[PDB]
């Protein structure tokens, strides 16, 4: 089941967790650093570095004739700022060690035996460093963003987080050149263009260039050596109003087939977990800007296209290989292959690839009930899988409507005395579901009319609460609140 040179199962889990723990911290760090960048004392000082002519270019007038010529002045302004900033940044220090680039599991484990001393760095030291123009490449960019914000340009702080690689199962990750690590930045800038409605990518420090990313970004690491400590997986963007969005999509060219499997977000719990973290750091409400960007991301997910390998089409978010189409699924009518994949080699075969959006999930009559649906009177299955079960599709089903509770709050129950609620739709019209490990006790204590609620199974029935008339909700709520006395 597993390769003989792979780490234990506990270690595989410890790495996922450590990866997560490390990730949050880095994202929290970028959040706080984003606040420091908005320092009032800092802005008033950096505002003095931008000539009045350049300030204008950064705020062009709507060119009726061709919007393209105003975006051009914006880019001309940024290029200007990029130049004067290189003059302002007198001293450029190297990273004491590896900066915020990715560390190996071996390095992280040895960080206790190879103790390091750290120079405490506070908010006030960051402000001093930026105003004097002294510091490593990370601090230099962060200051650059501060300057643009001082000129009132919607400029984001971009941070490519590098926690250790949890998909690395090797019991020993070792290495290894400084010039390779720093070929691509961890931090950079993004300026908003009102005229073209696109975020412009700016790197005034490392690659020292400005680019309007469409499909290819010069900032994404390339080459075995450069990706050693820089595996682009989570590119986070922080703005003036304390917003926090995951912008990897713009920088990862093979987001859905390569990057995805490296993210903790490749499964479901990781997708949920990660969404809580970004939420906890997003301190503002959606905006039109967030819609223009979401649109752009949409078009990038359409453009990525079908990958060129079998492993990449495995558990991909938008495509499936004909062989991986489950026995409980079928191709929707009027839909065919989305494309093909030729397995290279002499005895190489061609595989058909389908969009998941054209695959339909079929379910037995019981399975549909678990979704609160029943088969319509005139319905014939779409397939029959043997063990025999008949499977139907969503169109062959109708919404299940449970009887209403009586005036005394009585609920129609099954032979065993329970009511089944697998979807909010299965809750009687005049009732409600009270989910609490104590709800049944509180209800039995009150000796009121109710029904134990089975909401799932064990492989038997799992009671998670009760279903009660809506007018009995308060009484049971009271009892639950004070079960200490029951």
């Amino acid at each position: 089941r597993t390769s003989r040179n792979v780490c234990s199962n506990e270690e595989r889990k410890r790495r996922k967790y450590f990866h997560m723990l490390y990730l949050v911290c880095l994202m929290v760090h970028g959040f706080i650093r984003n606040e420091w960048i908005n320092s009032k004392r800092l802005s008033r000082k950096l505002s003095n570095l931008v000539p009045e002519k350049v300030f204008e270019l950064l705020h062009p007038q709507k060119d009726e004739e061709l919007p393209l010529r105003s975006t051009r002045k914006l880019l001309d302004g940024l290029k200007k700022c990029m130049e004067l900033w290189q003059k302002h940044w007198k001293i450029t220090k190297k990273y004491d060690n590896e900066g915020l680039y990715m560390r190996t599991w071996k390095e992280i484990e040895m960080s206790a035996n190879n103790k390091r001393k750290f120079k405490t760095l506070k908010r006030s030291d960051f402000l001093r460093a930026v105003s004097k123009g002294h510091g490593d490449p990370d601090i230099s960019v962060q200051g650059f963003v501060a300057m643009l914000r001082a000129c009132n340009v919607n400029a984001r702080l971009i941070m490519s987080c590098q926690p250790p690689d949890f998909t690395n199962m090797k019991i020993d990750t070792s290495l290894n050149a400084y010039k390779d690590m720093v070929k691509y930045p961890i931090f950079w800038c993004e300026v908003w263009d009102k005229f073209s409605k696109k975020w412009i990518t700016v790197d005034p420090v490392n690659l020292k260039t400005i680019e309007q990313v469409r499909l290819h970004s010069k900032l994404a690491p390339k080459g075995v050596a450069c990706c050693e400590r820089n595996m682009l997986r989570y590119v986070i963007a922080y703005d003036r109003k304390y917003g926090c969005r995951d912008v990897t999509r713009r920088y990862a060219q093979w987001m859905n087939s390569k990057v995805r499997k490296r993210r903790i977000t490749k499964d479901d719990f990781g997708e949920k977990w990660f969404r809580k973290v970004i939420t906890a750091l997003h301190h503002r409400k959606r905006t039109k800007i967030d819609d223009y960007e979401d649109q752009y991301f949409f078009q990038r997910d359409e453009s990525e296209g079908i990958p060129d390998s079998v492993q990449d089409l495995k558990n991909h978010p938008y495509y499936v290989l004909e062989q991986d189409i489950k026995q409980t699924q079928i191709v929707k009518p009027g839909c065919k292959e989305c494309g093909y994949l030729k397995v290279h080699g002499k005895v190489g075969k061609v595989l058909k690839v389908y969009a998941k959006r054209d695959i339909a999930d079929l379910k037995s009559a019981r399975q549909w009930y678990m979704n609160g649906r029943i088969l319509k009177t005139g319905s014939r299955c779409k397939k029959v899988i043997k063990r025999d079960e008949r499977l139907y599709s969503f169109e062959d089903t109708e919404l299940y409507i449970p009887p209403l509770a009586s005036a005394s709050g009585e609920i129609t129950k099954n032979t065993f005395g329970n009511i089944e609620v697998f979807a909010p739709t299965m809750i009687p019209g005049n009732c409600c579901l009270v989910e609490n490990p104590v709800a049944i006790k509180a209800a039995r204590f009150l000796g009121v009319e109710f029904a134990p609620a089975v909401t799932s199974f064990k492989f038997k029935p799992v009671l998670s609460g009760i279903v009660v008339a809506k007018w009995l909700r308060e009484a049971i709520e009271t009892a639950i609140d004070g079960i200490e006395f029951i």
Binding site: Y17, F18, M20, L21, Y22, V24, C25, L26, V28, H29, F31, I32, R33, Y95, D96, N97, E98, G99, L100, R103, E107, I108, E109, S111, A112, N113, K115, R116, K117, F118, K119, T120, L121, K122, R123, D125, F126, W273, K276, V277, T279, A280, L281
Partner: protein, 104 residues
């Protein structure tokens, strides 16, 4: 999350001004706070608020009492990264840790 005032202060300094210290700091904390595992997996948004809430050199060390006990256990022939795990799991109990290492 039973984070002492000392530890929460270090965590906040490290995450705000010295992120390059995250590796040694988190190795130290996740070892002394086993429950941290569940709270990070289950409710990361709480841990996040705690950090945003919290507010000339430093280093991340183990107590001299713990350092000596840990190495004392290692001389029994065990991997240091293992001993550190069990030691802080046995609520810093030397004899309880030895047993969990041998028997367990």
């Amino acid at each position: 999350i039973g984070l002492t005032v000392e530890d929460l202060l270090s965590l906040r300094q490290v995450v705000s001004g010295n992120p390059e210290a995250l590796a040694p700091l988190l190795e130290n904390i996740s070892a002394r706070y086993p429950q941290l595992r569940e709270h990070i997996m289950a409710n990361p948004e709480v841990f996040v608020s705690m950090l945003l809430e919290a507010v000339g050199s430093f280093q991340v060390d183990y107590t001299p009492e713990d350092d000596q006990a840990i190495s004392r256990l290692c001389e029994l022939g065990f991997e240091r990264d293992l001993v550190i795990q069990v030691y802080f799991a046995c609520d810093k109990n030397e004899e309880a840790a030895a047993n969990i290492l041998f028997s367990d």
